Paper text:
The crystal structure of the [name] [name] B−2533T β-lytic protease (Blp), a medicinally promising antimicrobial enzyme, was first solved. Blp is known to belong to the M23 family of metalloproteases. In the peptidoglycan of target cells, the enzyme digests the bonds in the interpeptide bridge. Apart from hydrolysing substrates for proteases, the enzyme is highly efficient in digesting the peptidoglycan of living Micrococcus luteus Ac−2230T and Staphylococcus aureus 55 MRSA cells.
The Blp structure was determined at a resolution of 1.57 Å by the molecular replacement technique. The analysis revealed that the Blp structure had a folding characteristic of the M23 family proteases, the LAS superfamily. Comparative structural analysis of LasA and Blp showed a high degree of structural homology (rmsd = 1.07 Å) despite the low (44%) amino acid sequence identity of the mature parts of these proteins. The active sites of LasA and Blp were almost the same and represented a groove, the walls of which were formed mainly by four loops (1–4) and the bottom by antiparallel β−sheets (β3–β4–β5–β7–β2). The active site of Blp contained a five−coordinate zinc ion by conserved His 22, His 123, Asp 36, and formic acid, which was replaced by Wat1 and Wat2 in the LasA structure. A comparative analysis of the structures shows that a ligand, formic acid, was located at the place of these water molecules in the Blp structure. Sodium acetate, which was used in the isolation and crystallization of the protein, contained a formate impurity. The C−terminal subdomain and disulphide bridge Cys156–Cys169 were preserved in the Blp structure. The conformational lability of the Cys112 side group in the Blp structure was implemented in two positions, one of which did not form the cysteine bridge in 41% of cases. Access to the LasA active site was more restricted than the Blp active site due to the bulky charged side groups Arg60, Arg68, Trp41, and Asn20.
Author numbering: 1 to 179
The structure:
Amino acid sequence: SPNGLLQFPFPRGARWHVGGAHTNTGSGNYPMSSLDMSLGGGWGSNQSGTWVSASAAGSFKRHSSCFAEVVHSGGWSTTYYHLMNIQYNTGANVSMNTAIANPANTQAQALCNGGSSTGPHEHWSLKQNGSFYHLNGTYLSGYRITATGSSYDTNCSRFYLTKNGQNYCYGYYTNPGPN
Ligand SMILES: [Cl-]
Ligand SMILES: [Zn+2]
């Protein structure tokens, strides 16, 4: 995703935790399409005010009660997994920063289509032409992503976000919007 196309998939102005890039399944080192993002709280916590947000405007796909996709321009799409309280149905037009769901606050709901999770979060992925895309060299909220390690690697020489020449390791990020 080129610089300016996508914002972080959480509210503009909010400050959420961003983990290391990983493949969709969490094993291997390619394509590292995915990032886990959360605000806080474990299983059972109140996530009803924690709003997973559309990375860009596009067309909504509600795959299940825990899994959504937004189809953007240019063959790009973003996907959002481990959800509850999805706010749109398939075919809806959503905007950049539209609140689309909460992170599922129970494991059974978070894993409604399989997988594993240690706690409430969104598993966000970038796709191009319907295939998982490798995040190295892509942009998110104006940060250039470097991802050259294995899944979930947070070593700050192999996973970091770069903006205005400064590198930033994994951790909490305030969402400025797409730039
Ligand atoms: Cl709708
Ligand atoms: Zn994940």
